């Protein structure tokens, strides 16, 4: 059976500028089955009111979701994204990089 590992990618809708009305995006793709667990984190603690796109896919048959929250950044705050799949042995947390 097709088991395909998610390809997470934490980023910003607009350029990473300290204290602003911006969106923290986390884009999971290249995965299969459909069932995914995706969380946004502010210093290891679960961001609430995190929204997501409608389940779609590629020619490839691999699902793709975009999970996004409205946010404001600080140098002090570590922003990331937790993701669990069947392909994932345990939740994979991916640190936001201001220039990635």
């Amino acid at each position: 059976m097709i088991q395909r590992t998610p390809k997470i990618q934490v980023y910003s809708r607009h350029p990473a500028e300290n204290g602003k009305s911006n969106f923290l995006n986390c884009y999971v793709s290249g995965f299969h089955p459909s069932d995914i667990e995706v969380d946004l984190l502010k210093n290891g603690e679960r961001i609430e009111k995190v929204e997501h796109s409608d389940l779609s896919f590629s020619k490839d048959w691999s699902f793709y979701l975009l999970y996004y929250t409205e946010f404001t950044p600080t140098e002090k705050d570590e922003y990331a994204c937790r993701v669990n799949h069947v392909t994932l042995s345990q939740p994979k947390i991916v640190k936001w990089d201001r220039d990635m």
Binding site: Y11, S34, S56, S62
Partner: protein, 274 residues
Amino acid sequence: GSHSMRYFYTSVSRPGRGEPRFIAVGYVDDTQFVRFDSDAASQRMEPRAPWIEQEGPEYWDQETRNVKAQSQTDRVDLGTLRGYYNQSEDGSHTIQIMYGCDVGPDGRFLRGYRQDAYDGKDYIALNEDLRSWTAADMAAQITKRKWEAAHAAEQQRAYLEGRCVEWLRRYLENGKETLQRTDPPKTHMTHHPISDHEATLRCWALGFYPAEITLTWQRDGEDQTQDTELVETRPAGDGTFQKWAAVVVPSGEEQRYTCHVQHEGLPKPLTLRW
């Protein structure tokens, strides 16, 4: 230029967790416009683009009728497929269908599409002729032979060749300002020192529509593939896309490298330099 309408359906069985989950999404080019979720409170095809909201309850009704009919079909089919591939009831499975049509600047037909997959692997697919089917296996062969006897192809083509292009025409008129737009990229450049003898050089393409973009690195005109890092085009969340390309260069030789951006919204290819 040339346009495309595409529907993506996903049916997921959930043994002991009730009934299977159906999600259907519709796009024109890179813009989604409709959705439907078996789960969601609504039980209607919802609009997910402004140009579609102008559509009457008569539209929304038929769309919902169509989608639920497929959803129920998939319900049955999920079981027929376990029977085929002799599988247990406890296991969860996925049926997906991807169908659409392409049209040229004219506003007329180019190609059709209908393809199915069970558990992410190719199952059956309608041929380019829209007259024949291709079965991915022994199981899919029974489906082919079934659909052959039902004359499914004829009906598929009829939609794919006609109805499909006809809706597209309409969606393009009614949604010109959104769909017929070309959003060229916002191109900048960043330097990241990784040594006093090395440094990563980044090139950013942001807020562009459609998603098709080409990012190419050059050292004095010579194309570079030697230590280039390119990220998967990602969406902004506001209906534009993001892509960046990076390269490792020797400190100071930063001026030697150029980045070339190819996008449909560009009259002539852009070139950046540190």
